[PDB]
Design a protein around this nucleic acid. Structure first.
Ligand SMILES: [K+]
Ligand SMILES: [K+]
Ligand SMILES: [Mg+2]
Ligand SMILES: [Mg+2]
Length: 135
RNA sequence: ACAU
DNA sequence: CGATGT
């Protein structure tokens, strides 16, 4: 119903899918960019969406912040809930980097706790998530 | 079908 | 138009 403005919003951007993947997190209210991941040469949209949420969790925990995270990705929200990213991307030399990051994000989820609500951004009602790349 |  | 996902 109502946007929770006191929140962090995340989104992925890519050049190709699979292709070059980046992501960022912003203050939902103001749009201030709070973190941005260096582009990863080959990944999928959903791996990026998942890494963005997990980085948001780590960012908020380190800062003792109870803010929720918004993501527009049905898939990534579920992968985080499950602590398991069920990507189809082949494992090879060119995908080694993103798969290492995905593996390590799952490992972090499996070794830490958090109460952070992970909320679905309702794009149909509210427009594009505030972290969107505008691509 | 829904979400990207 | 194509791809990633539940
Ligand atoms: K975009
Ligand atoms: K589809
Ligand atoms: Mg998105
Ligand atoms: Mg977007």
């Amino acid at each position: 119903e109502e946007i929770i403005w006191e929140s962090l919003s995340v989104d992925v951007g890519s050049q190709g899918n699979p292709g070059i993947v980046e992501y960022k997190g912003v203050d939902t209210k103001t749009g201030e960019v709070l973190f941005e991941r260096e582009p990863i040469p080959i990944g999928t949209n959903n791996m990026g969406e998942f890494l963005a949420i997990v980085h948001g969790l780590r960012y908020l925990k380190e800062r003792n912040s109870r803010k929720p995270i918004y993501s527009d990705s049905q898939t990534a929200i579920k992968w985080v809930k499950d602590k398991k990213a069920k990507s189809t991307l082949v494992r090879n030399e060119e995908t080694a980097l993103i798969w290492k990051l995905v593996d390590e994000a799952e490992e972090w989820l499996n070794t830490h706790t958090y109460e952070t609500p992970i909320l679905k951004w309702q794009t149909d009602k509210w427009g594009a998530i505030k972290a969107d790349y505008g691509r």
